[PDB]
Scaffold this active site. Structure first.
Site, PDB file in Angstrom:
ATOM      1  CG  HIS B 246      -1.717 -10.063   2.529  1.00 62.49           C
ATOM      2  ND1 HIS B 246      -2.530 -10.292   1.747  1.00 62.49           N
ATOM      3  CD2 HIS B 246      -1.371 -11.775   3.545  1.00 62.49           C
ATOM      4  CE1 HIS B 246      -3.592 -11.008   1.993  1.00 62.49           C
ATOM      5  NE2 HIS B 246      -2.849 -11.870   3.717  1.00 62.49           N
ATOM      6  CD  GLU B 299       5.816  -0.224  -3.114  1.00 59.71           C
ATOM      7  OE1 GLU B 299       5.024  -0.576  -1.901  1.00 59.71           O
ATOM      8  OE2 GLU B 299       6.303  -0.697  -3.757  1.00 59.71           O
TER       9      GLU B 299
END
Lengths: 374, 366
Positions: B246, B299
């Site tokens: 998301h 990330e």
């Protein structure tokens, strides 16, 4: 720049972060209970600290704190709080502590008990200091309680009356609701970190002078009253020169703090030599403060009698914060396990009220920034 | 306690002037300066540390002093959590309550750069001799000193990649480690004790923000040769797709954009496959849920950039910690000036009064 909500108070003052089943400081009722059990009944019946640890953590007796395994303290920093804070963090890799997220409650409970008692051993070793040889393990194995083991590992041949004093103090200081170090333990546990990391961070918060709860700095007062023989003139002299009476102030409970009562009683029962002067100081300090400002509700801080009891047990003044940390490990461990079972990450928000979008070249000092364009 | 939600979820705990992670506006700003300006213009980590902490440029992080790491625990996170704590007695750090802002700021900079030096030494490990200080002294930035202390002879493109990552990662609003730093600081403790506890909270797997474990995916794609097949394969065997999900920002995370650009600009060998995996993952995921905003996690590109600079996977959490020291230090100094203890409450709902005799196991107590 975002608007600040009308109900916002800094420091989360009065904001409810958790519900707990661990202990109830009944300030309206003037009583302190650990899992329903009154603190006065625990201390008066001389339930040892190791058993009160199990009571707070498990909710019942029957699995007391075990003795520490032999483990010479690897950290010698000159500060006891530092030695135990760093040494506890270092337990996770050598003992194989996985993150809290990866282990069942039983394993967490065992790791908490194993680390909690090593914290006491580390404090005793750090207090004994590097200039003394260690106390042999077989001398410590003669003892039948954890408190007695701690006093032996530190002092070698401790007075049994002083062992009883520490047991009373630690039980009375084991838990008291939410505070910055308990809160820090739970925040770290809520990330799923290992238990050693949570205890280590809590010790860091405990070391702050505004944390509250540390034994009061009353020994020069009691010395000044020993040599002058007149407590009231000393108490007035302190206040008249603009200083503050250590160990007295606004009420915490409805009236007398139940913990102050058990510690006054312990000092009396065990024959602490400073007992009378301390009681004379208490009477004079309450008298003077109460007629100087008769609207305020003033009571004796438990921290006043904490220092008396620890001084009796031969605890140096600069070691008293470490002794407070040692007893509070019970409440820290109980809250860590409760937080583990909760399984909710603690995450408050922050509102931005700073400068709006701007270029680097509009910020003071940008010309003193070196950048390469190789 | 009706509809009470534990964990302070959504509760506003502080105001701050440090940085704005304007997720719903699509931008990240450090003291108003856009993160994309900082990274694109190659502002080194030491200068961003000062920006966040001071609010202006000019007083960058100093180089670390020589100090062999005294803790060798096998866990880099533990070495720096314990080592930082031990700095207070040897360096004479008084409690925050007892010092002024300039002294606190000085102590934050001194300990913050020692944290980087400790991580560099811990990662290099005890089975290698240390890098001499005179070689580290040839470097002109703190990030260059870090990679020299660790790797001995680092590729300058790798130093640039780390500078990009650490600046991208220096600060991101309230989280468990920043919150822990503020709570400890609010007690008046010394700054080493606050950074030490923050590292404890950072080590938790639920903290969030550590580089994604995407290297086996990238391995399989470079071996099997086709990104879309592999992405389909991972989803079809019931696994999750690391590094995608998301949306976090309005659309593309701006830190993701600058990290991808730096990997491209510096010629990271894995860049072409990493770009193939990104396009395949977003397409495949956007197909399976067509009304959901899907974006690459920053990330994901953090792992790519760090892998490029030769950071092993088990050292990526420590690399993340290193960068975040800047935000931790900024928030500690702000908490200091705030001068207000963080004292939330707890509500008792346990058992009522009872005697010790009635409690299970009382027969065992002596």
């Amino acid at each position: 720049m975002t608007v600040v909500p009308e109900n916002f108070v800094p420091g989360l003052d009065g904001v409810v972060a958790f519900t707990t089943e661990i202990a109830e400081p009944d300030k309206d009722g003037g009583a302190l209970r650990y899992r329903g059990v009154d603190i006065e009944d625990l201390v008066s019946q001389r339930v040892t600290f190791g058993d009160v640890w199990a009571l707070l953590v498990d909710g019942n007796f029957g699995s007391g704190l075990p003795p520490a395994e032999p483990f010479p303290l690897p950290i010698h920093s000159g500060d006891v709080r530092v030695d135990v804070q760093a040494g506890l963090a270092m337990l996770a890799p050598i003992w194989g502590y996985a993150p809290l997220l990866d282990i069942d409650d039983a394993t967490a409970r065992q790791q908490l008990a194993r680390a909690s008692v090593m914290a006491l051993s580390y404090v005793a070793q750090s207090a004994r200091g590097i200039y003394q040889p260690a106390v042999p393990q077989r001398i410590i194995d003669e003892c039948s309680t954890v408190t007695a083991r701690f006093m032996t590992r530190w002092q070698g041949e401790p007075d049994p009356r002083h062992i009883e004093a520490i047991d009373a103090y630690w039980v009375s200081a084991a838990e008291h609701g939410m505070n910055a170090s308990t809160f820090t333990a739970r925040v770290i546990a809520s990330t799923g970190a290992d238990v050693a990391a949570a205890l280590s961070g809590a010790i860091g918060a405990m070391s702050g002078p505004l944390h509250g709860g540390a034994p009061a700095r009353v020994l020069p007062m009691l010395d000044e009253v020993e040599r002058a023989g007149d407590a009231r003139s000393v108490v007035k002299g302190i206040l008249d020169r603009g200083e503050k009476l250590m160990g007295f102030g606004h009420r915490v409970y409805r009236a007398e703090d139940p913990r102050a009562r058990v510690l006054r009683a312990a000092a009396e029962r065990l024959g602490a030599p400073r007992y009378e002067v301390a009681v004379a100081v208490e009477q004079a300090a309450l008298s003077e403060l109460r007629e100087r400002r008769p609207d305020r509700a003033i009571e004796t801080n438990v921290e006043f009698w904490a220092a008396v009891v620890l001084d009796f047990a031969r605890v140096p003044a600069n070691m008293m914060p470490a002794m407070f940390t040692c007893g509070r490990t019970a409440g820290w461990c109980a809250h860590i396990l409760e937080q583990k079972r909760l399984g909710k990450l603690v995450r408050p928000s922050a509102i931005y009220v700073g400068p709006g979008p701007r270029s680097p070249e509009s910020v003071d000092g940008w010309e003193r920034v070196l950048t390469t364009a190789h």
